[PDB]
Symmetry: D3
Subunit: 302 residues, 6 copies
């Protein structure tokens, strides 16, 4: 079972301008083959399907726990896309929009028109070409070593996509998210590499980084390394998965320093609200009446 905390994993900056094509590129990191939906669903299904949940417990704890972290990463990437698509971020009401004035005219010419037609200027479950995420992006073979080898690869392929998208947009909201997730993905790659070394004797972490560029060269990633976050494997569970430190120990690939398990999630930051976009009818064309209904739900004695 799962619980939810109404917080993003980190604070994101306020966007300052809508940037559709940046949002379309960032979609690769959400619903593309190596996006966060893929790391999430790979680890989630491997955790469901895991044989030897007690006999191979440290490895089960690892996959079950990292799957849980990736839930917050789909959330964070979706918030980033929503930030880039928001017309009036954080504002409950805009007035004066007339459909006949062609208020979505710009959207005719952007790469991803679906953001504005199917979505209400919001994230979709798709990649940078509009391709919807598909369950064949999941590998769940039942063989622990084969799955871990796949997962090591998956994290460094995902990192490669994050780096390339970083190089496509200088939007600060996108770069903040990417910097943080480069650091988290470095932790995951390192953790799967340590798990493989424990099972096989092959020193997989010595292959890192892939590609051969250090996170310290990406300013927004270095920001988070400077706070120590490359050392931390957070245990996203009240009472379970307590044996992570049997694998998550020893040296960090980033700097050689000792890594640690942190019990519980990080503090986080607030969730994002894109505000009213009347041309998208989101959350309604003129939402004042609905806001009044919600207000009155609280005004009650019962």
């Amino acid at each position: 079972m799962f619980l939810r905390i109404d917080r993003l994993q980190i604070e994101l900056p306020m966007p300052k301008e809508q940037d559709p094509n940046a949002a379309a590129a960032v979609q690769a990191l959400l619903g593309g083959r190596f996006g966060e939906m893929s790391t999430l669903m790979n680890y989630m299904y491997q955790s469901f399907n895991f044989r030897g949940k007690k006999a191979l417990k440290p490895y089960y704890d690892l996959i079950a726990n990292i799957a849980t972290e990736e839930l917050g990463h789909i959330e964070l990437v979706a918030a980033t896309i929503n930030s880039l698509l928001a017309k009036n971020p954080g504002k409950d009401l805009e007035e004066g929009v007339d459909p006949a004035s062609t208020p979505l005219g710009f959207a005719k010419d952007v790469r991803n028109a679906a953001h504005f037609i199917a979505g209400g200027a919001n994230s979709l479950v798709m990649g940078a070409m509009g391709e919807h995420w598909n369950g064949e992006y999941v590998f769940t073979s039942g063989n622990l070593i084969l799955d871990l080898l796949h997962n090591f690869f998956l994290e460094v392929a995902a990192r490669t996509h994050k780096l390339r998208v970083y190089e496509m947009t200088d939007n600060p909201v996108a770069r903040e998210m990417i910097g943080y997730l480069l650091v988290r993905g470095g932790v995951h790659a390192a953790a799967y590499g340590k798990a493989l070394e424990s099972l096989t004797g092959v020193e997989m972490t010595k292959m890192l980084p892939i590609p051969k560029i250090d996170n310290s060269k990406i300013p927004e990633a270095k920001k988070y390394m400077d706070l120590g976050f490359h050392r931390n494997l957070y245990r996203f569970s009240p009472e379970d998965y307590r044996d992570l430190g049997l694998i998550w120990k020893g040296a960090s690939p980033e700097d050689g320093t000792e890594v640690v398990v942190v019990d519980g999630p990080p503090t986080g930051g607030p969730v994002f609200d894109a505000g009213h976009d009347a041309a998208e009818f989101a959350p309604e064309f003129h939402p004042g009446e609905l806001y009044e209904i919600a207000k009155k739900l609280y005004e009650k004695a019962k």
Copy 2:
């Protein structure tokens, strides 16, 4: 962000033997169009994309919280499938399997061979025809009423699929899971119906049940209603989503009794471990050496 608890939402019984074609049918309820992946991802993305998270908070709390519950439902359905596919449930080591003796010969003739080739006799992210789940199964328009109308439909369409699969499968593991999720889906349909009543004045809950068959006609569902589970909307969060009772109040469609918000998740039941399947090389062909590696990790613990 999210947290994980290593418990299924209910306990499941143990099948007498593998039932591949039952597993293949139950896949519809996991990765098909109206499976638990779809309800999960619809509500998850709607919750990310929600505009007016404070101004429309009671409705945000509802979608965000039900999304969290559906995480445990993909888990529960996967456990059911895994139970039906497990050769040696709960048994860590089998001996004597010879690949040269065609130990997977039965799988040549089952509906879903992928369970045994791509999977290690485990669940996959697909429906009852082998169709992989796809992101176009998600509807996230940004318009609250349109989304809620969709979600009401989604729950009763999902219910219809659960009922039909129930009528195909006599296996207790499937009947228990389905009976439970018929009751939970009744709660979700009722909740979305109450939300639509509040926003629109249209008495959506009066349309229930769809199809026009009572959950009381399904023995396992009747048991869960006798335990009160049709009344309960669990708050799957440490501290958030405390306004569910503004919508989740009044009469149950099942029996007219007053519905309730329950603080926290249910206690549930143990997770499922399919054990060793040597022919599937899952978790390894001969896993004793890996079990020894894991044991030694604890000896070297700090």
Copy 3:
């Protein structure tokens, strides 16, 4: 624009009992690559997209009119599938079905479980592997000769699929439908071949039949030829497409006899009603109340 007549293009017989796997095979002829959806949508879109609707009118009339005929062919193939899937054909109310008794147990083991889960034991928009029909099965290039060459091929490929499914299914409903549509597909291939002869001088009809087997070897098709149906190109329009005989003239490939344009549709046969299937909740679990509602609508008629 289009009009509808509540008649199948031929009458169909009644199966003795349900035959799921026959239905699954016949799906190839509905939603597969060379099924009736494909011939329909190819000619429909070509007719929309046709350039030179007046200057090339005889050819426009041909494509526009054959497209209309193919609408009735998707209808006829769907009726055949529905006939094979119907538990109680023609019977409005069945009693005593208990969902708890696994009344759909047989469906666990059939090829196409979707017929019974997604469908209410009814046709779906898919082929013989469960693959849903897709718009990339349409070829609409705008070049008349290229399109007609494609359409000649499409008809003989579709014929080949019909012949192979005929050889799989002994059910009279399927044999009657297929025999009829072998004759109609012979007309369409001949018509496109005559159109290509007129435009190019290449004697395309001399290539027929493809494969090199005569429709006379298929008993149901032989009967329809004995009724003259290989000669007939029906004008499926009140007043339009009156120049079909400019192309549809001269010898039939089947027997050398003169072909004819028939004003209007054939008289055909009754549409099919699969009746009540309570386990499928179709049209309702217990439909008597809805039947009463419908009866009362007539009492309140103006």
Copy 4:
């Protein structure tokens, strides 16, 4: 069976300029998830699959008839796209096009290159991202109420997409089509809502409009309401489906006035011909010789 009338459902204006990206957006309304292909094929297959064609006749008449109207809507949307893609609308011959001069250079940079490569600058069976329409967009459950609930949703989701595309392009051909189809979709939503109220007692039409914006705010829709077309359910059949008025009666959601059944289709307007586009080889590179062949087919004595 079906008949065809060689007329669009309404007169469309002459385009005045090619607008590829407008055509790409309008594709959402043709082959996207909530485009006219989807409403068409949903109602068509539900009509084939309908159980109780006599016992539930008014409801059968409704679905069978609206399916037939949607055939003319795929035609109308395709004509709109073709208008936007036409280089020389209504002109049989253009001269002087040289392939080596890069006459399709603009198409390199438009969103939808397929319009110009796969199509001969014509409509395709796809949405606004190039996604081809797929049969999984059809819902045909066999349960009347569940299908009608789906269809109500489908019409208002389709309306939402039409409104958003309207707001993306000010092209008069697109806006004329959209205005008309907003009015027709309002009729369909109202009709399915009335059918649901008759079966369930739930006042579904009181939820309209969705989104909460009136068609009267869209000038091209108000044009058609001012002619009375929101009141009219046309019976697209010579002799069948005569019981529509048992459901289609009472108040219009638009203005409270009494709705009516109209026997037969509206008058319509001419079909559209995009003319010669030599660079697309459509209908031929230099079509004069083919036009002469067609002319000579008429010059005959026989």
Copy 5:
């Protein structure tokens, strides 16, 4: 079995500038429905599946051999795309690229972002809309005449796409490849047409060209015809498939001159190397260390 020669089928010119959208259009010719992947895989699988490899040997030789030629065409089209995507063609090392400087900023706005995210600025197995090539683009019916009819169509549909893409870009690398492959596709269409005439008596080559525009009107195609290459069917085999001349004989459709079989491949040209693209991390971010490792592999005594 197969052998490889490290040469393109022709010399291509050096690109001079990156042209992403030209590369995206040329993708239609690689991984689209009528691209070189399709002609390749159609003929390859037909050759595997061929019945009567001795009894119908000349026809087997034809399909087996043309399949082999198409391997070099996927190679040639991929080289063309890679040329259009190359930043530093032929250069092993570039220095001074900083990811934080947004070196891929242009790629945010191009049609095909996947070239830069999934690919390292390189070709992908997809068409001009980003659609990945799929095995349903292959037709392998087992019936020789039906397959040959399909293949005739396939070549002229492929030619039509090549012509349209030619008209979209004036890039010399693209136009050189297209000119050559127009000539080769003319040979293939002619060869399948001759095979059909031999089997059926229908003069299929008299339909050529389709569309009705001569290759001699395309300067880069005329270049290769002026060298005689429209006459040549190369036998891509050391010792097999020696009976091609039983079919490949008689007049060329281009000019009426006698065609010939050439034993062995043409001379070819060098392969293409896109060079270092540091922002794509291709072949590495800073490849000097890897180049030194490779150099040292040669410095050996053993």
Copy 6:
């Protein structure tokens, strides 16, 4: 460019009778995600897209050459499937088949009906669920180490699928093919592992085998190892790719013995001809006339 040799990489035995479901399982090894189409197309596109073809030549030679070997593997797997689907292997003419007698009745009930409808009882470009192979199964990042890591994984994932299908199918044709390709896949995994060791210092070959089962436990694979085939990397080229031994050297993972580069392809075995299947109209319904046409082509030879 490529050349073709009309030989399979090994000889195959003849099945006693058709085995449709065995063929359907073996399809996973052809067109599934980890089938031979995937290894082929991964290495083919990586070889096209390779940057530093001279500076990193030993690695280019390896990928380019292994790609060529995989061409013969799609051929070999297709031959295996065709063998399992052949009614009359090696027999040019069968008499007496009557389509009216349901000669394909068995095919109604097999897993893969497409083999008999779309195919003429022959292989298709799909996996074990009927899923067509797709280009998103290719990973071509441009980064050498990332690609090689992927390829190492791909080979062991493909091996895992081969092992599982082996365990499903007792047919000698399948066991021989799979035993051989287990040995060849061991060579490829070892080669990519050696390449990674050279570039990274990580001892990837020490992870082998994956899964942890020796090829010696599979009797057919053991025979091929006893013949030395695990040592051999064949140079599938007349004159190119002469630096394979710079990487392909040192110890075999199977037995510690020195590996070798073999100049040229193996001698292999005959290609397979499925013979006449009249019910499939393959190569024709009654092929005697076409056989006579072919005979006469030789009489008219030059």
